[PDB]
């Protein structure tokens, strides 16, 4: 989760989410 709630961080990093 964390900056996944934001397209920026979502599109980029999707290890993140």
Same mark, same amino acid.
């Given at each position: @989760? @964390? #900056?996944c709630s934001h397209? +920026? #961080? +979502?599109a980029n990093n999707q290890?993140?989410?």
């Open positions: @989760g @964390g #900056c397209p +920026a #961080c +979502a290890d993140y989410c």
